[PDB]
Amino acid sequence: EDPQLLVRVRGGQLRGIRLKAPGGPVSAFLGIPFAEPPVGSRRFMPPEPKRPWSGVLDATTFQNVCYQYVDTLYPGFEGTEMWNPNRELSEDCLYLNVWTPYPRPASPTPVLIWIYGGGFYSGAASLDVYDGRFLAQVEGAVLVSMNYRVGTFGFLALPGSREAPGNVGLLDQRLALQWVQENIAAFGGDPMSVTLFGESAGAASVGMHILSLPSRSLFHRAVLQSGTPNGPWATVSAGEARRRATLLARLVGCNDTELIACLRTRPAQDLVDHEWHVLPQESIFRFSFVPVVDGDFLSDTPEALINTGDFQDLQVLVGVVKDEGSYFLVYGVPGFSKDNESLISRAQFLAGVRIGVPQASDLAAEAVVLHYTDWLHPEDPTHLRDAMSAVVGDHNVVCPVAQLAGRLAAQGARVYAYIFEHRASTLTWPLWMGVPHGYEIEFIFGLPLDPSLNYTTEERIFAQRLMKYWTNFARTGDPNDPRDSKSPQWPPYTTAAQQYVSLNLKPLEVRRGLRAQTCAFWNRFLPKLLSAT
Amino acid sequence: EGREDPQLLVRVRGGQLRGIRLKAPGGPVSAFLGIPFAEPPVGSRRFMPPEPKRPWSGVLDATTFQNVCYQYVDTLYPGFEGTEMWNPNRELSEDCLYLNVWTPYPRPASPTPVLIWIYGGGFYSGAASLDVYDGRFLAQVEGAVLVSMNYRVGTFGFLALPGSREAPGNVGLLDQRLALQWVQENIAAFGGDPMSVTLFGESAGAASVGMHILSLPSRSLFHRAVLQSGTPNGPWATVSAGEARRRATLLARLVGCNDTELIACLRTRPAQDLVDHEWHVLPQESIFRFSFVPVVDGDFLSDTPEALINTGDFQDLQVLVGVVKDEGSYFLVYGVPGFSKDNESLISRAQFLAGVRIGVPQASDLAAEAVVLHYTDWLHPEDPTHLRDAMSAVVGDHNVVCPVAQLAGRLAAQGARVYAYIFEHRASTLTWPLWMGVPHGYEIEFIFGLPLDPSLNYTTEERIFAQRLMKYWTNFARTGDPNDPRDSKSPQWPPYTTAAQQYVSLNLKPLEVRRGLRAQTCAFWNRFLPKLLSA
Ligand SMILES: CCN1CCC[C@H]1CNC(=O)c1cc([N+](=O)[O-])c(N(C)C)cc1OC
């Protein structure tokens, strides 16, 4: 037996597996339980630490995926299926995965912890695009990723109740973070250098660990890709969460205690079947069961917490892709399809806006339409299509990111910002969607280094650059290569200069102002307008 | 008669006139100055519609400009040429309804297209006798017959108690219409063609031209129209009947005064006493707002200009409209703290916020917020140079550029032939500071061809430039097309259309075609702002 693949953790012994990366072997420990299975009476409850086990636990394979909705928009299409569960569904899903170099690091190595996205309703740490072997082999990183409960199972809340207090999926993440503190040194990981990174809902989660004190002692740096804790979709008020929960109960034939008891008798798929039916309006980029402002995990709204927080000892890397909104349009806006160029009329654009900005009053929706219309080409379908994408991307991601970056920088944080502008040569979505939400991930994780994936050689060089930025950020809080003696360097984002860089096949270019004018509209004007309409 | 120049003697409906032979750079022109076209609107006639001048006996001398209508005299920068050039250059009097005619010398052989100038000055000031309105160059170089009239301004022209018999309102506009009627009856005696009459005017003069377009009885008195930096629509050119009445009565009170009785009392007041209070009736601290302006009376103006341009059929209309590069800058020094001609007027963010309230005086807090948000450069939200320029742009866009854009769009969409320009050349002779750019009113001297006068020290290029502009304006008057039909080599000036939104740059360089008259920003003013108001 290979002693490199044998680790003792607090819970007992486990056996990992030696995997091939293009440049060498890595050690992988997959399917490690970090919690008691949250099943039966444990449904909707906070996670509890996994009890110890006898003998040697088999950690050579990915564990089940947390119970979730499965996308059927384009059955069998690679672009959608790549996000779908790639293992069996189960509520027994609280496991994490660790990749280290082979052999085990001689000295304590910086840890990256990945938190998957998926709108808080889906996702899994076992997807191919989250494969940690490349970062492990090439950058010598210790990489961790955990499953956490999504949908009703992770976020259904009757605020105040003992049996569905909300945010349990965030607690799953936190428990995993605790597990890393207590165990990662056994793998050669350094618990004094832990960097969280995540995309979309994963980024929002990272943001919430920043804004929740008990998490703060479990990591040192953060990366938020295309997602924030502030903004329109990442959280709900207690009242809205309570509302969605009792509506769901009503929908499945179900006093908090009684209501939750009856929900607990329901087969998992019965809950999933009605998950989407509780949203207050017809919308896109909106998810039924998400973190709730409980006054506990989140002591106040993310907006309020970023405004008043002290972030002096924090380093954050945040960024967006070129076309944040395009992906979501095919999931609710009439006129949009992956199978044509989605050229839309003016009427369709106005209709699309009420759906993309579902909380907007008539006047607010009018403001949006008039801001985004190109008055030189008010009825041009190509521009109306691209504007619809921009409305969704800006409202949900770009402007919330700009707001976050600004508050963090102003309040002591060291911040680096990017925009990712390279569209994968292997992308299966149409050209009109550009660089869609989620398609920087395969580059950060270094998938183009696998020659069987048919990425171009420029893309391989690109991926290697990104892996260096991310790992260097993990190691130091500064994504700049300490061996690169060339201008330009990646400068910190500040409120004065507002510098950020473009990530693409060309060398780093420095830009100023992350949609400054348009985000002033979203971040400064619209709230005034809503609180008056 | 018998020993004088036989080429300077002309008879009009009211009697005989003797004009004067004037020297223009390229030769002599005929001038007939101070021709009376109405009975003096004095005494019991104050605030009343003008009556046609009754015939005189003998030969009326028409060799000098007549009185300037009673008005406020600008004292902001006493003695400074930049202000004094707009001030009265003849005696102030309520007896001021006179007009001027320039024609070639000797007078034209065949009927000649007529240009009629209507001066600006916010409806509270102005005169046809100012140097910048000298018709000698257009007459000499282009062979134009040019006419300009004095019309009543301020309280005298526009104080209204709507519905009353003694102060119906808009009488300054009726002064103008009467002059237009005078041209129809009499211009043929000078060689002018009453069947080709083009109105042109700047600022309030432009707004006046627009109101003639929108008022049925004026429509039969002209054929084409030019509106320079002004429109009948927009925030300043008209007030509601209720607002006019409110201002009229407040003014009456401030000077010691049933409508009949109130107006009777106002008629006993010295002209100067009215002038001394006219600024005091404005409802807010403001700039680009004027107390006594045309009123929406349901008569001269059957409805608001906005409603009239929206639902009008303008198939018969050919218009030339445009703006200068810095419409707003001139106005900032008349009321926005931080601004002066004597320094760079770099301002703080605080002064910008306050300036916006003054520049958009009718704005709610939310609307003002929208304005500040839109004009702020969020990369440099506190840069004083940018803030100064933004303040200017706020005032210029709100009052002129966006109302012009609105007018061009409605007219084009409704059958009119529209030509649009932006004027971007700053006179080498300008006495205002550089920060003001090309201020409101400073294209006028070029259109009238003043740089042809060697004593004025314009550059040779400005002289060539002026000649180009006179060509465009006179070609438009002649044909409804500013382009020279016998050139083709020169770049062409395409019509403004809703589909392409083309306009040309007017400067020292050959015409350049651009698209969208501040399309994005003017969508804010013209489409979003009003909806924010009705909320
Ligand atoms: C659109 C981008 N995503 C993120 C991960 C992969 C892909 C999957 N699907 C979505 O994110 C997604 C979104 C919405 N929505 O509200 O926009 C939606 N509605 C039915 C309302 C449904 C969705 O998937 C089934």
Ligand SMILES: CCN1CCC[C@H]1CNC(=O)c1cc([N+](=O)[O-])c(N(C)C)cc1OC
């Ligand atoms: C500012 C442009 N004009 C037009 C012709 C020359 C010059 C003359 N002066 C004005 O037009 C002018 C304007 C305003 N105003 O409303 O901004 C104003 N007050 C607010 C009192 C006073 C003014 O003159 C005394």
Ligand SMILES: *[C@@H]1O[C@H](CO)[C@@H](O)[C@H](O)[C@H]1NC(C)=O
């Ligand atoms: C694209 O296809 C969808 C459904 O197949 C349809 O709703 C839409 O009208 C189409 N758009 C175009 C560009 O024809």
Ligand SMILES: *[C@@H]1O[C@H](CO)[C@@H](O)[C@H](O)[C@H]1NC(C)=O
């Ligand atoms: C310019 O002049 C005016 C009036 O004297 C003054 O109020 C303003 O503050 C001045 N600005 C500067 C930068 O001197």
Ligand SMILES: *[C@@H]1O[C@H](CO)[C@@H](O)[C@H](O)[C@H]1NC(C)=O
């Ligand atoms: C033009 O130039 C001459 C010579 O310098 C000068 O004396 C005269 O005053 C100037 N004229 C004007 C109108 O400024």
